[PDB]
């Protein structure tokens with residue numbers, strides 16, 4: 001039976017299939033313990049489920065917030081990306097038209113909105129990302145408020161998924177990490193660890209002509225099933241390959257971020273991404289610019305290291321090496337990389353300044 005990913009038959013079969021529980025890799029942590037200390041101690045290599053919002057500093061509206069309200073705050077005439085799940089093709093319509101669809105009592109289509117970034121709408125002020133995200137995020141920490149280049153617009157997403165909707169396996173753009181909060185309903189995540197062969201398998205799969213006919217989880221040793229219920233929050237680490245299935249109508253909020261715990265994986269994903277040459281819809285805008293700002297901050301931290309005699313932790317120094325490599329790669333090359341370079345940056349001087357500083361540290 002040659003079925004397509006996201007088809008009614010596929011979903012039907014996917015619902016009945018058995019998966020190792022995410023009990024094996026996903027840590028349950030109360031909102032208050034999810035601190036910079038916790039993250040630094042553990043290294044954010046595994047998904048984290050926070051069952052209850054308390055202590056997260058997450059701000060969301062009450063579950064009494066319906067799809068019709070989203071239409072009201074966002075704007076019924078706003079253009080929105082809509083995935084037809086069963087075709088696995090994307091299209092664009094008015095929010096009001098999707099809403100009309102959502103409230104139909106005989107939907108003949110399976111349609112989701114998963115790309116709706118609402119930072120530029122009246123709905124923005126109803127949602128604030130978890131404090132830990134603000135703490136880890138490169139953009140939040142290191143992208144100046146007065147920058148000439150617009151911040152990456154990936155901070156506040158509203159997701160509206162109907163029953164039996166499916167998003168196929170993917171790595172988030174930029175190897176970015178993610179938080180997902182389920183406001184109403186539930187969402188099932190299928191989580192695959194970014195072990196080196198898994199990433200390599202994922203690239204070959206995603207680049208195969210007939211990937212939409214192949215269930216990726218069939219190719220890996222372990223694909224963990226994680227149900228995220230109403231009121232719960234999931235944090236997905238850099239590089240994890242995941243898909244989702246929505247067992248009932250679901251409303252969720254989400255955001256993407258880069259952080260210093262996963263410099264290596266972030267660059268890896270980015271490289272996979274630039275090879276696949278796909279997407280251009282869910283892409284992490286100005287990933288490279290965020291890296292440039294981080295390079296600057298690093299050079300500024302290495303230097304402060306001389307006034308402190310307090311060397312930099314190994315993972316930052318190794319981050320420096322990775323970013324410097326990427327910097328060298330993007331420059332003297334080539335003609336589109338320049339478009340992501342922040343004002344008043346001297347690419348050549350930063351690179352040499354960082355190489356020396358890394359040199360000094362190792363010595």
Ligand SMILES: O=C(O)CNC(=O)C(=O)O
Nearest residue numbers: 114115157167244254255
């Ligand atoms: O639909 C999905 O599960 C994938 N979601 C996204 O990448 C996002 O916008 O956070």
